[PDB]
Amino acid sequence: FLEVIKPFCVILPEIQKPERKIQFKEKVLWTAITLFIFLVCCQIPLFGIMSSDSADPFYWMRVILASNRGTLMELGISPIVTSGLIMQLLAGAKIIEKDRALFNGAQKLFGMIITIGQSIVYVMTGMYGDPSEMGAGICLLITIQLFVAGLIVLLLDELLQKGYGLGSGISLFIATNICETIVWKAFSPTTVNTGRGMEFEGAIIALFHLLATRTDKVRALREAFYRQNLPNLMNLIATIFVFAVVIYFQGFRYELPIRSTKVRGQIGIYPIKLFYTSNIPIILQSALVSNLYVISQMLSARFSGNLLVSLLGTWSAYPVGGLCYYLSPPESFGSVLEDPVHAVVYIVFMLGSCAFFSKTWIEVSGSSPRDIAKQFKDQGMVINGKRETSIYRELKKIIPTAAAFGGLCIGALSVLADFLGAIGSGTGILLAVTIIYQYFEIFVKEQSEV
């Protein structure tokens, strides 16, 4: 089995380790090149799309998958996630353990085989036109294009994670899509001519165009700051304010005065961040909500009328009643005043889900007080003013509360962003700013080492 899959294992391309330590400058340039390639592929449509006027079945997963419908990045970061999950599954199942080359290659072969299956499913969901009217040739060509694009995504993520980059493909591509969306909504030259005349979609471009055209400057300013058809400057101000507050709360940290005992003189500080799980609660809550949205839409487009389906969230698209409605951010402050109960339920759901996801994530990923105490025992580190047996007790005092309250605060920031109507949404803003802060942490760590 292993011998016969060895060739198919090592036939796909692999990234060569730098064998050096790439300077931060070259790493930044290569990260920029990687995100440029991703963005270029996100704007190039697939060949063979007979019709793209259908409703996107996976619209709610585009932000969390860094996907763009009908382009070369329809799957987005799906190949990376598929390869990682299949690798973890086969490792936990103890199917397999110079064995690393076979192990790393196998996740590429199996990862793309599942990726091919995903592309076939995507084609058959009714997008890209009717697959019966597309023909086997056009569907095969679309599947080949998606397979090659997923291979390229895997190569880019491997480049980033093997040393020509500043992290992982997942975070980079998600943050890149979010930032591109915000900057587009702020600076787009798209003009829609409904009613009065041409109106630039970009909020700042809208400001300048309205001031230039309208004779009444004050009315132009009011329209620019409170335009509802297209993004306004008030949304941009809310986005900047949310950036500022999330940055401020991301800089919060509890500094443990640790001290080495195995080797003397290695004093230091162990920072326990308030956002202990960096945007993991946001990722998990967004994935839960997006899965519920997709399932509810599928069930309400095929089994419409059932009591359970109608209770899972009715739809007009945006939910108007049900679980998917009480899990959805309100449209505006007027919606908050119209139905206070929904706003309260949404706030409670956001805070509770984020806190629960944060604590369960520390317990799952092994950042709990027990694991940190075990690490402290391994490296021989002890806290300056505490004994060698109270290491777990102090970690039990800080870390669980830190994780729960960091989840609570990140959910509260997401709720605040949603209420203020910031561009990019609460999830999007939180994800983007947390990923950029991860890059900033990498920079400061490298600078301190240098």
């Binding site: 996976f58 997963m61 969390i64 998958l65 799957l75 799906s78 996630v81 598929t82 999950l85 599942i114 990726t115 299956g117 995903q118 499913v121 994935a287 839960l288 997006s290 899965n291 997709v294 399932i295």
Partner: peptide, 7 residues
């Protein structure tokens, strides 16, 4: 299909 089974 969906977050995070293939998707």
């Amino acid at each position: 299909x969906l977050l995070x089974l293939a998707x």
